[PDB]
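fwd from M.: "can u put these together and see what the complex looks like"

so here's what she sent:
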Amino acid sequence: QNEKLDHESVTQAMQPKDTPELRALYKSFEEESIIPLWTQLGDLMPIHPKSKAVPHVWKWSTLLRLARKSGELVPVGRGGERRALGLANPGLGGNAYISPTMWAGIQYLGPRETAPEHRHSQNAFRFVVEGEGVWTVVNGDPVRMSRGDLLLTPGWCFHGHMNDTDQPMAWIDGLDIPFSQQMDVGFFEFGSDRVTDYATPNFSRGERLWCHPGLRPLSGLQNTVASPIGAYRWEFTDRALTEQLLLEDEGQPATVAPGHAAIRYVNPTTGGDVMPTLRCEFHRLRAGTETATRNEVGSTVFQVFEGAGAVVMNGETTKLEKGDMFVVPSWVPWSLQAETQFDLFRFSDAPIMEALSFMRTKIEGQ
Amino acid sequence: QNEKLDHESVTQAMQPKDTPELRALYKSFEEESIIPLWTQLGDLMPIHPKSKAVPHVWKWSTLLRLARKSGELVPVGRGGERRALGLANPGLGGNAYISPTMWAGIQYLGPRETAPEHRHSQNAFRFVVEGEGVWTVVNGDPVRMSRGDLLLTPGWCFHGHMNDTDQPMAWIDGLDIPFSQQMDVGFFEFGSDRVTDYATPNFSRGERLWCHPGLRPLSGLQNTVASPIGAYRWEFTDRALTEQLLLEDEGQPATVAPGHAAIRYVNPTTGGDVMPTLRCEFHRLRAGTETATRNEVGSTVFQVFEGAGAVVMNGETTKLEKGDMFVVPSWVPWSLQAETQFDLFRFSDAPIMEALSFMRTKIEGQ
Amino acid sequence: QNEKLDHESVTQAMQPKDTPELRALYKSFEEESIIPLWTQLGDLMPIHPKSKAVPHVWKWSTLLRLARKSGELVPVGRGGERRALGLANPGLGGNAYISPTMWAGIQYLGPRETAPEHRHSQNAFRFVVEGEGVWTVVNGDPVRMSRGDLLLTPGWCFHGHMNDTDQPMAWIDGLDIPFSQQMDVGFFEFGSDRVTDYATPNFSRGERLWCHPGLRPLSGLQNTVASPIGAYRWEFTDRALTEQLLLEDEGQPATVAPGHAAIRYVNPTTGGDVMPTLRCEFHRLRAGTETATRNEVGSTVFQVFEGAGAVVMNGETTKLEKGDMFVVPSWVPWSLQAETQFDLFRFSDAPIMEALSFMRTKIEGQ
Amino acid sequence: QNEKLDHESVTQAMQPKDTPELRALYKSFEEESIIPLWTQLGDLMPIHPKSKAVPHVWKWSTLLRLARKSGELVPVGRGGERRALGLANPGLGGNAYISPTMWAGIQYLGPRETAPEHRHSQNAFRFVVEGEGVWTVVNGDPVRMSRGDLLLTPGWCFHGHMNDTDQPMAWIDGLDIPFSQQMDVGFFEFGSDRVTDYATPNFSRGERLWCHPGLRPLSGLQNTVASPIGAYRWEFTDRALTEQLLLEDEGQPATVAPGHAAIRYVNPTTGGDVMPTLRCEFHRLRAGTETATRNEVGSTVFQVFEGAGAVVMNGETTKLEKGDMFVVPSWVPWSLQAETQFDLFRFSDAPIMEALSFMRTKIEGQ
Ligand SMILES: O=C(O)c1cc(O)ccc1O
Ligand SMILES: O=C(O)c1cc(O)ccc1O
Ligand SMILES: O=C(O)c1cc(O)ccc1O
Ligand SMILES: O=C(O)c1cc(O)ccc1O
Ligand SMILES: [Fe+2]
Ligand SMILES: [Fe+2]
Ligand SMILES: [Fe+2]
Ligand SMILES: [Fe+2]
């Protein structure tokens, strides 16, 4: 009976008589920094999530144009720290937030530039749809950046970046900046003005210790809150996804849904998410795959890595190409449709929702 | 060297030449929903937390006057749901938030009133500095409300309240409403218009199963995300705190600091916090005790339960009496000073900060 | 097909030709400390557990006679340490083991005696069906021993005992002595020759900190591997079990099965078992209750605390009275039958089996 | 004072007068299945672990001779199940136990033989110092066996083995058979008489899903009690150990001690041990390395994989060659000395000791 009621259809039984005494009470509320629940229940406590953030798509071709022009006109260095352009959700009041929890940006580093070293409580990762040439130095450990690589920079790790070539590179940054600003957890420290090691090894020290499947160094027996892997290289991700599709061909369980291969990047000390606030995945859909529509608590962002296809959000189809980016705010129904084989990088605030027992998932047909 | 720099003293090296091409770039950013990092680094990523919320104190005598007047002029019922007055931080832009994460309110239920049944993903607790007469029915289990009691209503539990007497009662509510609204995790369901059981037992079913020290029913071997204890009664809290002070008198370790007894209300299935987002404590300071100044990540709220004393926040002393309430936003230096024996109820968002590895603590002298 | 085969009915296909060369091979095995699998598969790896321990019952009246006579003839003191009589399973080859994992003993302390202080890696508890007068001093904290009390002495805690009266007292000890001896984990240290504190408070320091339901001292926020509660007093256990039966009367879920109230004694820092190797429970069956037959991996021991009834093991009924003790070895089918209201104390090695993922449970009808 | 006392030097104060009444008491103890503590304290509860197992070394050349001769004279098949020769500790009374917890055996499979399919609660792994040709089929998933590979068969997984060539292969088995027999946790089921899949892929399905560093299939988000990796191939182990030694050369932390590279094989869903009862490691010592002497609770076994060196146990040096095996019982002081670069495979019961909080470690110089 009452379970089908919403805030529009429910009887409003707390409507006081509009008298001078009531207006005086309400005036007194304002003077005393008091705001009654009864005038705002439905907004404070909706039937289901109703984000101020809206679903939205940014074209890579547009992001690249603006990043390149920024490369001409704006020098990178101290103070501003990075030449990064945050994707700003139209629904979030002028804040540089792609969602209420996450920052997503395109960053551009021109020939031979250095972005100086700093650290901050905010967790961060880099992802590269295309390019090479930059190394990012994380606690003194140079990490090469290449197409298809996920690079991590967990909170409070010193990091700076350098272009070792005569050619520009762009990539995307994800951070829990919006969550951290609203929740007041932000600390920041300036490090050196130049990265602490200009060497450019093929593979970082973190990788050389931690990227052997199923093996753990005896010197690393303590679990970490964030992954000690600095780089999740394209080769491994590509091979994982191929094997899932091959295993499917062979009638063996592997794919998460038919024609839908997918992995989660994990902290190898625990098997959990890469960082406390941020979950990263990579999806590969066979040509013609259409995912079942999901509603999920919290926000996610995808970047198209390869192939052609579309996303549906709130019933609306938007065609997508290589590098395009979209955000799905909390509880917005979404699905992906593959035209060709369709590869996507994904990040979300799901580790926050799951840690606090706020996660819910509705899946079409299930 | 660079570790002592802040956003005011650092060199700003990303100041572009102010030309028509630059203004055209910046205009293009606006059209494309792009906001560059370099114009806002320092605000997005402060050196240490700088909350928009400000420290603030609400007098119980004022809260009571406004709650009582609301009792005359505003009927309680469906739609508005509760006659509750939220403490609204002056720094939080007109939102009914005591801090960026927490709602705190005074609720008033007059003679023989019922507040109807509903549930919501938001976690909630009731605390009572004074009064008796109300029972709150939580998933059908009537729970008596009395002076000094902490009553819990974890997320998604049906709850409504009824005054069984001819006398009014007031109490405080705490909820993770602000966190839940900003993060988009809110669900809500209307239940019955009248509580489902009007019986008024001395002790609830939850208590009769779970409030025997060190004992666990074989029917309750599964751990819960929130405490199954609906009521943490004043008797136990009072006795715990007395025993700590007695143990101190006897030269035995017990108190958390000298003359400072304190407990945390816990989920007995895990030994952890009562609910995923909210931590509740109770403190008792010997006359003359002055706590060491703390900076802590995240916000806390205290209500004075008994005795006289003061709080210091940002170096500013405010004298406190029975029922007065104050909020300490993230990283604000705070201490308590006991004039007489000084009893306080405390809640905070610390389980959020600790789950996500954002907690930090600075203690004066340590 | 092959799933119904056992070691008696399976084809034995590794029967070598009995030749001089084979006997020479087998002789060589002996010289080289080699024992082939094929001559002993079925014994090493049975179809289901087949303990050398047998179900067995010890009469309290017999245990008391022998303990009392030991009180006359054997002095208690250093070296031998305790006047304790271990229940020795007839199936375990003369070892003083009630089961392959547990020691159970009756201990007797005469008027004004002291049993001196020591510690050992082996975990221990005391349980009292009857008597008063002894205090056990655990890390310097005197703990009163009374009828119905469970007293804990986790591994590596100094403990000694003293009779403060002119009257003898007996109780039962449980320890993981057999597990610890076979697995080679035993350490032992002699402490003082007399307990370190002869005071006899009603309640220990551990209890005064930890026995308030749902409350945790801020000085005790670190979780422990064993419970910091030294005494689980009869009052709480009795009240817990009564409330379950009352809740059942009221149509409310509480009892573990119909007419079967039961609790587990738990570590309040975690909600888990009292000690890493040993699980303690207390059961109360309504007159006429018959439990469903269980097979469970690992061994358990019960002592009858009050009332009359029977146990069935391997289909065999043995009538039981106050104080009688029985052991149920691994996978032996067992049930309890209540003649009157039937109260039993229970301990087991279940935390070992569950930690190592060896637990299985078969329940009749389910 | 009393801390330096042991069971040989302590005063024995419970020596009763040897009278007819005492001998009658003691006789009565025997009739009633009672064994007093005071006549056996020191044996039941030693000052530190004193295993019945003794340190011992088995020569690979001897193991190979006996396995090969067994290959001629004993057919492999149903009933006996495997042609495996257990290493029997001289101190363990004729039981086929290398230590009180572990079985270690050499298994031999001749040209074209099949060992039929079964499962058991006991956990198992295979390790190969030399050879190729056998596949082991684990829950229907064929897993190739090659030099340097660790193959897993967690408890209750169906497994059988087949030689796909005209050449014999030998390897070592480790199981928690002794623990499981003494603790009564053993279940066993006969599966098919022939393996269920004779195909011989280079890599199993488990590996194709789980052996990509830092990546987890979305279809495998549930944690497992044992590793889903069926094969830890030599390539990865070799590369891990090389990188540690290279990182050391570069002044970077990696090795567990100087010139001592080492990894632990882990469950990738948790970062923990491969199976609940058994820990597997692989060590590589630079020529000339001498490890610091350790005492550790519980037993370990090593097999020499490559190079030459020695072990010291109880102060006694034994020179070791490729394939030689040794056991170090609980609390025996041990160290390894590398003559050439010295590679060893290691297994132990450490996950049992650590789960139950019985682990202790003494390291020389630290
Ligand atoms: O360090 C970075 O590369 C960075 C990039 C961003 O897009 C936002 C904040 C950052 O600190
Ligand atoms: O149910 C309540 O009593 C309640 C009280 C508040 O102050 C705010 C939200 C609520 O749902
Ligand atoms: O300390 C004791 O009371 C004790 C009792 C036993 O029955 C066996 C071993 C012990 O250490
Ligand atoms: O299945 C095996 O290969 C096996 C090997 C052994 O050495 C002992 C028990 C077994 O079940
Ligand atoms: Fe950064
Ligand atoms: Fe509510
Ligand atoms: Fe003892
Ligand atoms: Fe086997």
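replying to her w this: The pocket of fe (ii) ion (ligand 8) is lined by residues D 118, 120, 124, 159 (CB under 6 Å).
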